[PDB]
Every structure is written in C-alpha cells, then in structure tokens.
Design a protein. Structure first.
Ligand code: HEM
Length: 153
C-alpha cells in the first residue's frame, strides 16, 4: 500500500505525462524495444519497424502508446482501489497477448527512465520511489489475476 503522499507524487508527475501522452508513449516503447528487443516480437505489426525514426513515424504505434498509458493512468488515479480498472487488461494480456510479468517489469523500467529524462525536477528520489511502488502494485495485482486465469507467464 502507498501513502497518501506517495500517491500525490505519482499523480503530480502523471499530470506532467498528460501534457504529451503520445510522445511519452513513443519514448517508452523505443526505450523498451531497444533495451529488451524480445518485447518487440509481441507486436505483429510493429516488429517490422527497423529504426527509431520509423518507430516515431508509426501512427499505429503512437496511438497504441496513448491507449496503454490512458489505461495505466486510470489505474493510477484509483490509488490502489483499481480492481475494476485493472481486470480487463489482466484478462487480455493473460489470454490473448500473453505478456509475461517480466515484460511488465521491462516496461515499468522504461516508464521510470522516460519520466526521469523528461521530468527530473518532478521526479526526484521521493517521486521515483512512489512511482516504483505504484507500478510494483500494478504488477502484483496483474500477476495475481494472471494466475486466476491460468496464465503462468
Ligand atoms: C503498463 C503496462 C501496459 C498497459 C497498461 C497495457 C495496456 C493495454 C491496453 C489498454 C491495450 C488495448 C486493449 C487490450 O487489448 O487489452 C493493450 C494492447 C496490447 N498490449 Fe498492452 N499494456 C501494457 C504493457 C504491454 C507490454 C509490455 C506489451 C508487450 C511487450 C503489451 C502488448 C500489447 C499488445 C500486443 C496489445 C494488442 C495491440 C493491438 O493489436 O492493437 N502490452 N495494452
């Protein structure tokens, strides 16, 4: 469980993300695919994008990042009371996309990296620790749902 002050730090920097969801999402994916190229293989269409400029030019990939970050933002804003918001993504990622927990760690690391690169003044040690706690909680609850649905990845 996060403190009220930790949630405020999470939501303060998430308001900064919302000034450019699309660009944050692009940077997160580029970082994710570069640091962990195996994650690109889960995207049938995007895995054929060969350079960083091709990635930024893909409207499909840009729209996908907004879709992902909008769902994450809606989970974060429930400050842990997020079962109704989290369950549908747990379902699709367990039964259709098959995204292992390790890959959710990889993208959490990319989120942390991008937030620090774009928002250092709003992402000091305390802020980073709170965002890390919130993404850990997301992954913990995603993992429990994965199991309930029979997905051990
Ligand atoms: C913060 C973590 C993530 C969130 C919040 C998130 C959320 C979403 C949402 C809302 C969708 C669209 C609806 C759905 O199909 O469920 C989606 C689709 C998808 N996600 Fe995720 N996702 C995350 C991480 C990942 C990761 C790490 C991968 C792969 C490495 C991945 C692969 C996909 C794929 C393949 C789709 C289907 C896209 C399509 O065919 O258009 N997701 N995700």
């Amino acid at each position: 469980v996060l403190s009220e002050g930790e949630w405020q730090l999470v939501l303060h920097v998430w308001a900064k993300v919302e000034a450019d969801v699309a660009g944050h999402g692009q940077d997160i994916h580029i970082r994710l695919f570069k640091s962990h190229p195996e994650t690109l293989e889960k995207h049938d269409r995007f895995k054929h994008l060969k350079t960083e400029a091709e990635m930024k030019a893909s409207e499909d990939l840009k729209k996908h990042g907004v879709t992902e970050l909008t769902a994450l933002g809606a989970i974060l804003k429930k400050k842990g009371h997020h079962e109704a918001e989290l369950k549908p993504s747990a379902q699709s990622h367990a039964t259709k996309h098959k995204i292992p927990i390790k890959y959710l760690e990889f993208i959490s690391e990319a989120i942390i990296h991008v937030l620090h690169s774009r928002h250092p003044g709003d992402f000091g040690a305390d802020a980073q620790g709170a965002m890390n706690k919130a993404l850990e909680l997301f992954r913990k609850d995603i993992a429990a749902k994965y199991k309930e649905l029979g997905y051990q990845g």
